[PDB]
C-alpha cells in the first residue's frame, strides 16, 4: 500500500476530516500542571496549548524554569526536535536561553510576525546588523550577522553571546516566509526545498542539540515540519518505505506534545509532503 494509493482513496472519499478526528480521539493526554501554575499564565500564548510535564524543556535558571516548549524524541528515526510557541514579548530572553542551554544550532520558523493583522510572534531576532538585541533578564546578546532572502524562505546567520562568559555561538535561523494566511500551501515543493536546506546546513545532525521549531502556537505548521522530516528519515532507514504509516508516526509525536497537526488540511498537506519528498529522494488573473 503505497502512501500514494491511500492518499488517492482518502481524497476520493472526502474523508480527511474523519481520519483527522480519529487521530484526535486516539491521541495521548498527559498532565500539564507546571504550565497551568498561576505564575506561568503570561508565559503561554494560548490557554489550551500547553507542554506536557514529562517532555517540557526546563530553563536552567533558578526563579522560574518554565517555557512553552516540548522535546519530541523520535527513537527509531534517531532525531529530536524542540517544538515551541512563537516567543511572546516577555519570553524572548527565555527563548534564547533555551537555545543556548540546549545547544541548538538551528531555529526553524514557519510563520510571519504579523498575519491576518494580528501579532503571531514577537520580533525576537534583530532585523538590522547594526541594532543588536540585548536580553537583560537572561544575559544574552543577539546580533544579525547576515541574511539570504529567497522567494519562499530566508536563512539568517545570527551570533548569540552569553554576556556572563563572553562565549559566542553561531545560530542559523531558517524562516519559511510564505505559508498562506489561510489554509496550507497548494504544493509542498517550497516547503520540501526548505526542509532539505535545513538538513543540508547540518543543524539536524547528532553533533548538535535538537533543532528549535515554532510557528505561532508551536503545534500546527511546526507539526508538519517534524512529521514530514521524521517520516522521510523512517523511510530511508527501513528497508521498506511503504511500511511507514504517517498516522502512527503522528500519534507517536503526540505523546510528546499535544495537538500536533491542527486541521484536516494540515494532515492532507503532510501526506503530500512525505509522498513528494520520498519521490524526490495556468494563465489566470483571479485577483
Ligand atoms: C533518541 C532520540 C535521538 C537520538 C539522537 C542522536 N538524537 C538527536 C538529537 C538532536 C539532533 N540534532 C539530532 C539527533 N535524538
Curated annotation (Swiss-Prot):
Positions with a binding annotation for substrate: 181, 215-221, 262
Main location: endoplasmic reticulum
Tissue: Expressed in keratinocytes (at protein level).
Modified residues (Cysteine persulfide): 215
Crosslink (N,N-(cysteine-1,S-diyl)serine (Cys-Ser)) position: 215-216
Top-level EC class as recorded in UniProt: hydrolase
Any one Gene Ontology molecular-function term assigned to this protein's record: zinc ion binding
Protein name: Tyrosine-protein phosphatase non-receptor type 1
Organism of origin: Homo sapiens
Residues of the full protein shown: 1 to 298 of 435
